[PDB]
Amino acid sequence: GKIEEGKLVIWINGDKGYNGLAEVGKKFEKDTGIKVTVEHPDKLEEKFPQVAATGDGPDIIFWAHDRFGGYAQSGLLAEITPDKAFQDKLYPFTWDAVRYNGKLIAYPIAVEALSLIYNKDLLPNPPKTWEEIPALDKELKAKGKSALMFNLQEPYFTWPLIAADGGYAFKYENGKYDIKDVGVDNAGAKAGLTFLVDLIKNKHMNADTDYSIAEAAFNKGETAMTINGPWAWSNIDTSKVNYGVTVLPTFKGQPSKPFVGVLSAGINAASPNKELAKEFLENYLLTDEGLEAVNKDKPLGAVALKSYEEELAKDPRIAATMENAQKGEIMPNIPQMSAFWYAVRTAVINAASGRQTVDEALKDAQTGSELYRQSLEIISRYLREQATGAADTAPMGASGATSRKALETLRRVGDGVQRNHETAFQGMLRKLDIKNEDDVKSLSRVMIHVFSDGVTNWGRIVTLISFGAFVAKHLKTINQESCIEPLAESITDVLVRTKRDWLVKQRGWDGFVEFFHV
Numbered sequence: 024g025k026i027e028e029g030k031l032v033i034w035i036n037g038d039k040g041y042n043g044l045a046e047v048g049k050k051f052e053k054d055t056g057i058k059v060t061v062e063h064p065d066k067l068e069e070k071f072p073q074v075a076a077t078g079d080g081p082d083i084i085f086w087a088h089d090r091f092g093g094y095a096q097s098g099l100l101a102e103i104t105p106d107k108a109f110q111d112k113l114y115p116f117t118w119d120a121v122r123y124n125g126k127l128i129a130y131p132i133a134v135e136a137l138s139l140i141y142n143k144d145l146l147p148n149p150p151k152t153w154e155e156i157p158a159l160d161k162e163l164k165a166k167g168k169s170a171l172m173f174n175l176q177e178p179y180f181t182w183p184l185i186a187a188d189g190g191y192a193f194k195y196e197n198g199k200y201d202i203k204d205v206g207v208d209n210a211g212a213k214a215g216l217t218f219l220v221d222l223i224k225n226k227h228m229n230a231d232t233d234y235s236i237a238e239a240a241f242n243k244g245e246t247a248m249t250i251n252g253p254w255a256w257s258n259i260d261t262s263k264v265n266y267g268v269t270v271l272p273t274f275k276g277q278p279s280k281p282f283v284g285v286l287s288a289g290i291n292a293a294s295p296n297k298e299l300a301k302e303f304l305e306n307y308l309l310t311d312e313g314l315e316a317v318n319k320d321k322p323l324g325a326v327a328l329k330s331y332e333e334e335l336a337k338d339p340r341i342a343a344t345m346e347n348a349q350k351g352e353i354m355p356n357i358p359q360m361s362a363f364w365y366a367v368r369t370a371v372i373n374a375a376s377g378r379q380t381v382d383e384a385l386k387d388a389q390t391g392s393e394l395y396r397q398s399l400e401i402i403s404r405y406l407r408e409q410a411t412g413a414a415d416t417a418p419m420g421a422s423g424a425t426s427r428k429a430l431e432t433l434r435r436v437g438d439g440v441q442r443n444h445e446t447a448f449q450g451m452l453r454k455l456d457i458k459n460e461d462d463v464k465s466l467s468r469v470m471i472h473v474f475s476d477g478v479t480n481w482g483r484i485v486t487l488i489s490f491g492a493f494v495a496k497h498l499k500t501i502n503q504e505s506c507i508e509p510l511a512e513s514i515t516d517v518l519v520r521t522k523r524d525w526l527v528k529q530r531g532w533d534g535f536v537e538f539f540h541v
């Protein structure tokens with residue numbers, strides 16, 4: 024619909040210091056008359072791209088940087104353009120976290136990493152290895168306690184162990200991440216996940232443990248250890264637990280490697296308050312007194328602002344956060360991440376419960392994460408074939424056989440669709456406002472309403488791609504060939520994330536090829 028002009032609405036996760044952030048809003052209001060309203064809706068990272076796609080939602084959205092690439096792919100975020108003087112106040116690697124396609128798409132706030140939190144009056148000398156946690160639990164269970172409890176429902180918490188001995192999402196390569204090479208099902212990951220499942224099999228942990236259960240158990244003193252981030256420290260300070268924060272245990276001699284998030288603030292593209300949003304973020308929040316105000320509600324961890332981080336670095340809890348972050352890896356921000364997470368979430372839940380074995384669970388995850396790449400391979404060269412004088416090399420034997428037969432199929436069925444629905448395609452394109460690269464993103468938004476609503480079948484999918492080819496022809500026509508590849512990425516993103524389960528159910532492009540058997 025429409026975002027309200029002349030005020031700021033902010034969405035931040037319910038575990039962060041939202042009250043502290045609203046106090047920064049009060050100072051902003053005092054100085055300007057502009058009211059700032061902080062909201063903490065459930066599933067805001069899932070809701071944001073739904074409401075933002077219809078030109079609605081908050082002015083500012085807070086989340087870890089990994090989600091932001093997807094938002095930017097669908098044109099939901101304003102480009103941010105701070106001057107050099109302001110960029111110098113934050114650590115360069117935080118700015119890297121929020122750079123997508125050579126554009127800054129958010130303001131970095133804080134560096135979040137998981138640590139091992141332990142009760143000093145149950146266990147003054149915590150274990151340096153995962154391997155020694157079973158023996159600790161055996162001893163503590165005879166005392167009516169347990170060794171370790173943490174959220175097994177979110178793969179963010181289990182990933183440090185899965186990655187320890189070689190598991191990886193998409194291989195880092197000199198700042199860049201190659202989607203061609205995914206490592207969710209390599210030996211390192213199997214070993215890590217197997218060890219977790221053994222803990223559950225031998226009753227050292229419970230597969231149904233979640234954030235709420237773990238937090239309560241630790242804060243009541245029922246378990247000697249938990250895994251959590253700086254935001255959690257606040258509720259422990261309130262409890263009667265003398266706790267420490269330290270490096271995560273090693274696995275097979277190898278450090279636990281958490282995926283490190285940079286909590287970031289992005290500006291809704293549909294906002295009529297962009298200049299106010301930037302003024303708030305640069306000049307009220309990202310100051311010593313601004314972050315102090317948020318930090319005092321719930322610890323942010325290590326902060327992106329150099330001046331204030333220097334003060335925090337003295338706290339031993341922050342030293343531990345940083346030790347864990349340096350041993351981990353900063354997450355990619357690419358649009359694939361969402362699918363990857365959802366895929367790994369399913370794998371751990373199934374392996375832990377018994378529903379699948381570890382090998383079967385990681386295999387399905389490997390597929391669910393790969394799909395984005397193969398999809399893009401096919402859609403890219405279909406659109407390019409259709410729109411331009413490029414050589415049609417797929418039949419000449421350029422890419423894999425699945426891509427080859429998918430393209431052949433698509434040439435037959437897709438061209439049929441374009442022949443028969445010429446006027447309908449003209450009508451939809453004319454209703455769209457496509458003359459540039461920004462507007463190609465506006466397709467990303469619109470179509471999910473047209474595409475996602477209702478059932479899913481290959482027919483509807485061919486229609487989406489076929490319409491994409493029709494739009495690519497238009498782009499070529501108005502000297503905009505450079506948008507065809509971004510257009511293909513939009514379609515591919517919109518499709519894979521929206522129909523991930525179904526696509527995996529159908530066995531991806533092999534299914535498509537089968538369905539029509541051209």
Ligand SMILES: CCOc1cccc2c1OCC(=O)N[C@H]1CC[C@H](CC1)CC(=O)N[C@@H](c1ccccc1)C(=O)N[C@H](Cc1ccccc1)C(=O)N[C@H](C(=O)NC)Cc1ccc(cc1)NC2
Binds near residue numbers: 470474
């Ligand atoms: C005008 C731009 O249209 C779209 C652009 C991007 C995404 C979409 C667009 O379609 C909206 C629409 O109503 N566009 C109109 C203008 C384009 C037109 C569809 C209608 C294109 C078309 O013929 N699509 C047909 C089709 C596709 C491939 C081969 C033969 C037929 C289609 O999607 N039919 C399927 C049934 C089907 C057909 C063949 C194999 C498997 C399943 C369907 O589900 N059909 C649905 C149904 O309720 N009963 C048959 C209707 C439907 C079809 C496709 C979609 C949505 C609804 N795709 C989403």
Ligand SMILES: OC[C@H]1O[C@H](O[C@H]2[C@H](O)[C@@H](O)[C@@H](O)O[C@@H]2CO)[C@H](O)[C@@H](O)[C@@H]1O
Binds near residue numbers: 090177
């Ligand atoms: O579990 C997958 C989940 O991991 C990360 O979410 C973290 C977030 O970064 C933290 O700030 C905190 O809120 O805990 C979350 C896990 O419950 C990713 O950022 C997220 O995209 C992903 O779904």
